[PDB]
Amino acid sequence: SQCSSTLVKHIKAPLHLVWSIVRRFDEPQKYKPFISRCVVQGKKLEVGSVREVDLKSGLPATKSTEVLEILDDNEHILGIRIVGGDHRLKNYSSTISLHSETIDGKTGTLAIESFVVDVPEGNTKEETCFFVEALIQCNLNSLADVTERLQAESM
Amino acid sequence: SQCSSTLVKHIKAPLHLVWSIVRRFDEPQKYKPFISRCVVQGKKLEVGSVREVDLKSGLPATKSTEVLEILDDNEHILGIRIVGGDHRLKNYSSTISLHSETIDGKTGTLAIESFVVDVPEGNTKEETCFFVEALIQCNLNSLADVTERLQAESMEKKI
């Protein structure tokens, strides 16, 4: 009836740098490959700020409206809830927490993204949820590439 | 700039049965899981015939317009081309063939499906193809499920 799943990604870059990008609720296109532009109505980073995402051309969907639900600069957590948009996903919530770990002897970040979303009418978990897992996996993969180029650029 | 890939499915049912379903160009609902309605204009399944597919509710796209390109009852090939719909898929074309096999001392069918589609611009092949492979793997796995249940039912009719 509803599907929750958790995606994990190891990143070869320092936590503060990774947070610096993740934390931008007004700039998801920073690393999310399917976003074209983003507009935040109100003060960009408060809990309750709505954003209006425009996806890129030639994808199944074109727009998404999302609400920032948690931004914790302390425990490094970011929660959103999608609330509208032509993708037709219903009741989607997603949290990304960021933990400090050590990868290949140097400092690194674990990304943990959880999400919950209703399985559409007439379709099974087995048909649907691997698409949502894929998108996020892709989103995290891109965060890694982006952050690591940034951490490499610093040298 | 183009996304090309082939998928494979080993199905535990006779070829006559799988083809029985797969050749149904007017009813991809029989096994494809996202499809709600299929209208076919004029001739049912003759090369050139077009189908308007309606997707089920709550999905990122609602309609697809596809064309029958190959229907071969003898060689067991079904080729289609998508030419419209709101999935925004550009130059999608797919083709599926069914082949007979004897594996583990029990008859069966290998299905093998190859697709080709344009990659959305401003996105890379890496970010986008696995999505198309996955949907097809999804249809293939479903085909095995549907087909194999039918075999089991038929084998239940043992008297």
Give the residue extent of every domain in chain B.
Answer: 1-159
Using a CB-CB distance cutoff of 8 angstroms, which residues of chain A are in contact with residue B57?
A: 88, 120-122
> CA–CA distance from B60 to each of A13, A28, B57, B91, B138 (Å)?
34, 20, 9, 19, 16
Determine contact: B59 vs chain A, CB below 8 A.
yes
Its CATH class, for the domain covering B1-159, is: alpha beta
In the chain, the amino acid numbered B159 is I
To the question of whether residue B61 is assigned a binding role by annotation, the answer is yes
Contact A59 B120 (CB under 8 A): yes
To the question of whether residue A88 is assigned a binding role by annotation, the answer is yes
d(Cα B133, Cα B94) in Å, to the nearest integer? Answer: 11
Contact B60 A134 (CB under 8 A): no
The distance of B120 to chain A (nearest Cα, Å) reads 5
Q: A1-155 belongs to which homologous superfamily?
A: START domain (3.30.530.20)
To the question of whether residue A91 is assigned a binding role by annotation, the answer is yes
Q: Number of A:B CB contacts under 8 A?
A: 67
Contact A138 B120 (CB under 8 A): no
Contact A57 B121 (CB under 8 A): yes
Q: Are A115 and A139 in contact (CB under 8 A)?
A: no
d(Cα A123, Cα A84) in Å, to the nearest integer? Answer: 21
Cβ burial, residue A108 (10 Å; 0-12/13-18/19+): buried
Technique used: X-ray
Q: In 10 A of CB B98, how many CB atoms?
A: 23
Q: Where are the alpha helices (DSSP H) in B31-124?
A: none
The resolution in angstroms reads: 3.0
Determine contact: B14 vs chain A, CB below 8 A.
no
Nearest to A79 by CA among A61, A97, A99, A63: A97
Using a CB-CB distance cutoff of 8 angstroms, which residues of chain A are in contact with residue B56?
A: 120-123
Tokens matching residue A139 = 């989103």
Nearest to B140 by CA among B3, B2, B20, B6: B6
